[PDB]
Every structure is written in structure tokens, then in C-alpha cells.
Amino acid sequence: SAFITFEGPEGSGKTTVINEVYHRLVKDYDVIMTREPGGVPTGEEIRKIVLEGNDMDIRTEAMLFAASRREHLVLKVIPALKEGKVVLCDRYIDSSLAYQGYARGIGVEEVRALNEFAINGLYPDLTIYLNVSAEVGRERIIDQEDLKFHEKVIEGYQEIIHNESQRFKSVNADQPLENVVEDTYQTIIKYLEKI
Amino acid sequence: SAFITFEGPEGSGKTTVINEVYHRLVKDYDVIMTREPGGVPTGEEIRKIVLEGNDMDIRTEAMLFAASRREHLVLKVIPALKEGKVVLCDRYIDSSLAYQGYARGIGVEEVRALNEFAINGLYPDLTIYLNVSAEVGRERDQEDLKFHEKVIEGYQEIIHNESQRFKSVNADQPLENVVEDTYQTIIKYLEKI
Ligand SMILES: Cc1cn([C@H]2CCCN([C@H](CC(C)C)c3ccc(C(=O)O)c(Oc4cccc(Cl)c4)c3F)C2)c(=O)[nH]c1=O
Ligand SMILES: Cc1cn([C@H]2CCCN([C@H](CC(C)C)c3ccc(C(=O)O)c(Oc4cccc(Cl)c4)c3F)C2)c(=O)[nH]c1=O
Known part of the structure; x- marks a missing residue:
């Protein structure tokens, strides 16, 4: 079994990369692809609260x-890993660290303590970071507040990866998506075949 | 202003005590009574998930x-404290410590760390613990009785590590005496500013 998460800012082609990597891995491994809330009822109700929120306090949002992360983890991720599957998860703890923690300014360490209560030791075995430059990312997306937030998410991810190098594998997401797909696929197959 | 919370297991007389204390305090203070979620829209939505739910993971529940606690604190408690109000709050951080942390077996320090993220340093000015014995509290199935006992054991462990804001009121005595001891404790804190 393997728990592999995918991280990056918007415009990193992350969703495109995970779907293509998944289509290729299914030919050789027992694997599922998922994301939060991913159909878990309580998680879906939690998502409705997040999306209906008007300038919601950032700690309540975190x-x-x-809470959505714990429900998804308990009802989808853990049973799949128990069944010996490879689980590909699009966004996990690092997304709360970069977004709520760094970019929103709650602080990475505070948001990490919150998420450690939620995941109860279940950190990914490997995290694929789609390292896109702010300028390339912006072009894949297409005001000043949005550009500044996008750059702060990127800075956040750099700070997280600097302190946890062993868990992460950075993939150059500025290259064409065919190459991003190929480098990500190779990184995963290398980790999996070493187990 | 003052942020006063009330803690205790079931059968402690808490709802009666808060209401009677509110009626006495309102003569000298601008006081409000509240409880989480307390009408805060996001908190009300959260409460529906906790209630209209089945076999929910205990950590998700905590x-x-x-989350409801933070919403009620930021949109209701803090604005009332800014108005100079005495806020009488029925259950706060210590209920999560006793119920989620001790009784449900998540762990007290793990639940404390989650709730310190939620309250972000806003601990109560005073906390009234309505100290009722498991036997007296039971009178006021086996699983529910063991859980009620676990809750009291939980509350006992919290005060064994904290004494400043914590004020234990003997809640085994008749309700008139419980109200008097509570009111007198609050007024002694409030008069000392
Ligand atoms: C997993 C995760 C994602 N994000 C971001 C990633 C980039 C997109 N955003 C937006 C934020 C909203 C407020 C505009 C987003 C976009 C789409 C959905 C969507 O699902 O349509 C969404 O709802 C979610 C997604 C995951 C979990 C939950 Cl509870 C809600 C969402 F928050 C979430 C965080 O900030 N923190 C996290 O832990
Ligand atoms: C504040 C608090 C209370 N409780 C208990 C105290 C005893 C009553 N119970 C029940 C549990 C449910 C699952 C049956 C309870 C009873 C009534 C309501 C009710 O309000 O009808 C309720 O809903 C709430 C109350 C506070 C916050 C939220 Cl999110 C939901 C509730 F959880 C909550 C905890 O376990 N943790 C806390 O942080």
C-alpha cells in the first residue's frame, strides 16, 4: 500500500497531472484517486458550510x-490502504499548511498542530509538489489581491518543503503538461517499485 | 466586562443556576446569557451536523x-465583551476537555491543543464548575452511568492542573444554596474588577 498526495497552487496543472498519472498507474497497480470531501456525507455537508461562508473567520475555515480531512481519511483513505491499494489524494495536509497557515497568516505551525489532531499520524508516504512559477501558474489560470495570494501560496509551499524534504518530491511544473505528467509518473513508479 | 463560563456534568443544576444568577446580576451589570452555537449561522449549521448524524468519528466531532466554539466566540462573545457586558456562557473549552478529551478517550492534552487553536488565547475570566458527585448527579443504562462518571473524573483531572479562573461550587447541596454560592463567587470576582 501507498498513500500519495498531490500539492500545488492553482495553475500548476495539478488536477490534469493527477488524472493522467492515475490513468497510467491503474494499468499496473491497484489504485484509487480521491480528494476531500470526495462524497463522504459529513464531509460534503462541511464543504457546503465552507462555500456558503461570507468572510468566515480563517481559524473556523481551517x-x-x-474536519472534512478526518472524515475523508477515515471513510475512504484508511479502508483503501487496509485493502493494500495505492491511494492518490489530490490535496491533503500541505494544502491547509500553505493556504490557511501561510497565505492566510494563521501560521504553519498552528495549522500543523490542528491537522495533526485530524490525521493522527497518517502523513503521506510521498507528496508530489507541482512546482510552478507564479508567472506560468497565472497564465494557466487565465486582480492584484488574487496575484498576491497566488504568490503567497507558492511562498508557503516553498517554506513547507524546505523543512520536510524527505517526504516531498518536487516536479518542475513550468514544463509542458506532457513532461509534468511523465516526470510525476516516473517519480511515483520509482517510490512504488522500491517497496 | 467579564467572560464567565459554567461547567458541569448532567444533573449539576447548571441551566437553573445560570438563569437565577442572571436575574440577580442584571440589577448591577449589563449581562447576557449564551451557549454555543448561540444563533451564530455557521455554528447553527455545524450543530445540525453533530445532531443529525450517525456514528461520527470522535475526532471529527471534537x-x-x-468550530462552533470559534464562531460563537468571534461573532457573539467578543462583540458583547466590547460593549462592556458580563457574558454568562453555558459550556466552553472545559466541556470539550471532559467530554471529548477524557470521557471519549481522545486524550485531554490533544483536545486542549485543538481548542487552544479555536479560542486563540481567549480563556474565560472565571469558570464556575458545578461540582456534583456522580451519585447525586445520577439522581438529579450502565454505559450512560459509566460515561457520566468518566465526565466527572475528567472535570476532576482539569482542576487538578488549573486553579486561577476555576471556582468549584459544591453542587450536591440544594439548588438555593448552589445559586447563592455561585452568585457570591461571581460578585467577589466582579467587585475585585
Ligand atoms: C484541501 C484544501 C484546499 N484549499 C483550497 C485549495 C484551492 C481552492 N480552495 C477553494 C476555497 C473556496 C473558499 C473558494 C475551494 C475550491 C473548490 C471547492 C470545491 O470542493 O468545490 C472547495 O471546497 C472544499 C474543498 C475541500 C474541502 C472542503 Cl471542506 C471544501 C474549496 F474550498 C480551497 C484550502 O485552502 N485548504 C485545504 O485544506
Ligand atoms: C460544549 C460541548 C458540549 N458537549 C456535550 C455536553 C452534553 C450534551 N452533549 C450533547 C451531545 C449530542 C451528540 C447528543 C448535545 C446535546 C444537545 C445539543 C443541542 O444543542 O441540542 C447538542 O448540540 C450542540 C451543542 C453545542 C455545540 C454543538 Cl456544535 C452542538 C449536543 F451536542 C454535548 C460536548 O461533548 N462537547 C462540548 O464542547
Whole structure:
């Protein structure tokens, strides 16, 4: 079994990369692809609260992402890993660390303590970071507040990866998506075949 | 202003005590009574998930009580404290410590760390613990009785590590005496500013 998460800002082609990597891995491994809330009822109700929120307090928002993370983890991820599957998860703890923690300014260490209560030791075995430059990312997406937030998410991810190098594998997401797909696929197959 | 919370297991007389204390305090203070979620829209939505739910993971449950707590604190408690109000709050951080942390077996320090993220340093000015014995509290199935006992054991462990804001009121005595001891404790804190 393997728990592999995918991280990156918007415009990193992450969703495109995970779907293509999944289509290729299914030919050789027992694997599922998922994301939060991913159909878990309580998680879906939590998502409705997040999306209906008008200037919601950032700590309440972080706790709701963490509660959706726990429900998804318990009802989808853990049973799949128990069945010996490879689980590909599009966004996990690092997304709360970069977004709520760094970019929103709650602090990475505080949001990490919250998410450690939620995941209870279940950190990914490997995290694929789609390292896109702010300028390339922006072009894949297409005001000043949105550009500044996108750059702060990217800075956040750099800070997280600097302190946890062993868990992460950075993939150059500035290259064409065919190459991003290929480098990500190779990184995963290398980790999996070493187990 | 003052942020006063009330803690205790079931059968402690808490709802009666808060209401009677409110009626006495309102003569000298601008006081409000509240409880989480307390009408805060996001908190009300969260409460529906906790109630209209089935066999929910205990950690997920703890995070939802913590999220409702933050919403009620930021949109209701803090604005009332800014107005100079005495806020009488029925259950706060210590209920999560006793119920989620001790009784449900998540762990007290793990639940404390979650709730410190939610309250972000806003601990009560005073906390009234309505100290009722498991036997007296039971009178006021086996699983529910063991859980009620676990809750009291939980509350006992919290005060064994905290004494400043914590004020234990003997809740085994008749309700008139419980109200008097509570009111007198609050007024002694309030008069000392
Ligand atoms: C997993 C995760 C994602 N994000 C971001 C990633 C980029 C997109 N955004 C938006 C934020 C909203 C407020 C505009 C987003 C986009 C789509 C959905 C969507 O699902 O349509 C969404 O709802 C979710 C997604 C995951 C979990 C939950 Cl509880 C809600 C969402 F928050 C979430 C965080 O900030 N923290 C996290 O832990
Ligand atoms: C504040 C608090 C209370 N409780 C208990 C105290 C005793 C009553 N119970 C029940 C549990 C449910 C699952 C049957 C309870 C009873 C009534 C309501 C009710 O309000 O009808 C309720 O809903 C709430 C209350 C506070 C916050 C939230 Cl999110 C939901 C509730 F959880 C909550 C906890 O376990 N943790 C806390 O942080």
C-alpha cells in the first residue's frame, strides 16, 4: 500500500497531472484517486458550510478543512490502504499548511498542530509538489489581491518543503503538461517499485 | 466586562443556576446569557451536523464542537465583551476537555491543543464548575452511568492542573444554596474588577 498526495497552487496543472498519472498507474497497480470531501456525507455537508461562508473567520475555515480531512481519511483513505491499494489524494495536509497557515497568516505551525489532531499520524508516504512559477501558474489560470495570494501560496509551499524534504518530491511544473505528467509518473513508479 | 463560563456534568443544576444568577446580576451589570452555537449561522449549521448524524468519528466531532466554539466566540462573545457586558456562557473549552478529551478517550492534552487553536488565547475570566458527585448527579443504562462518571473524573483531572479562573461550587447541596454560592463567587470576582 501507498498513500500519495498531490500539492500545488492553482495553475500548476495539478488536477490534469493527477488524472493522467492515475490513468497510467491503474494499468499496473491497484489504485484509487480521491480528494476531500470526495462524497463522504459529513464531509460534503462541511464543504457546503465552507462555500456558503461570507468572510468566515480563517481559524473556523481551517477547522472545517481539518474536519472534512478526518472524515475523508477515515471513510475512504484508511479502508483503501487496509485493502493494500495505492491511494492518490489530490490535496491533503500541505494544502491547509500553505493556504490557511501561510497565505492566510494563521501560521504553519498552528495549522500543523490542528491537522495533526485530524490525521493522527497518517502523513503521506510521498507528496508530489507541482512546482510552478507564479508567472506560468497565472497564465494557466487565465486582480492584484488574487496575484498576491497566488504568490503567497507558492511562498508557503516553498517554506513547507524546505523543512520536510524527505517526504516531498518536487516536479518542475513550468514544463509542458506532457513532461509534468511523465516526470510525476516516473517519480511515483520509482517510490512504488522500491517497496 | 467579564467572560464567565459554567461547567458541569448532567444533573449539576447548571441551566437553573445560570438563569437565577442572571436575574440577580442584571440589577448591577449589563449581562447576557449564551451557549454555543448561540444563533451564530455557521455554528447553527455545524450543530445540525453533530445532531443529525450517525456514528461520527470522535475526532471529527471534537473539531466540529471547536468550530462552533470559534464562531460563537468571534461573532457573539467578543462583540458583547466590547460593549462592556458580563457574558454568562453555558459550556466552553472545559466541556470539550471532559467530554471529548477524557470521557471519549481522545486524550485531554490533544483536545486542549485543538481548542487552544479555536479560542486563540481567549480563556474565560472565571469558570464556575458545578461540582456534583456522580451519585447525586445520577439522581438529579450502565454505559450512560459509566460515561457520566468518566465526565466527572475528567472535570476532576482539569482542576487538578488549573486553579486561577476555576471556582468549584459544591453542587450536591440544594439548588438555593448552589445559586447563592455561585452568585457570591461571581460578585467577589466582579467587585475585585
Ligand atoms: C484541501 C484544501 C484546499 N484549499 C483550497 C485549495 C484551492 C481552492 N480552495 C477553494 C476555497 C473556496 C473558499 C473558494 C475551494 C475550491 C473548490 C471547492 C470545491 O470542493 O468545490 C472547495 O471546497 C472544499 C474543498 C475541500 C474541502 C472542503 Cl471542506 C471544501 C474549496 F474550498 C480551497 C484550502 O485552502 N485548504 C485545504 O485544506
Ligand atoms: C460544549 C460541548 C458540549 N458537549 C456535550 C455536553 C452534553 C450534551 N452533549 C450533547 C451531545 C449530542 C451528540 C447528543 C448535545 C446535546 C444537545 C445539543 C443541542 O444543542 O441540542 C447538542 O448540540 C450542540 C451543542 C453545542 C455545540 C454543538 Cl456544535 C452542538 C449536543 F451536542 C454535548 C460536548 O461533548 N462537547 C462540548 O464542547
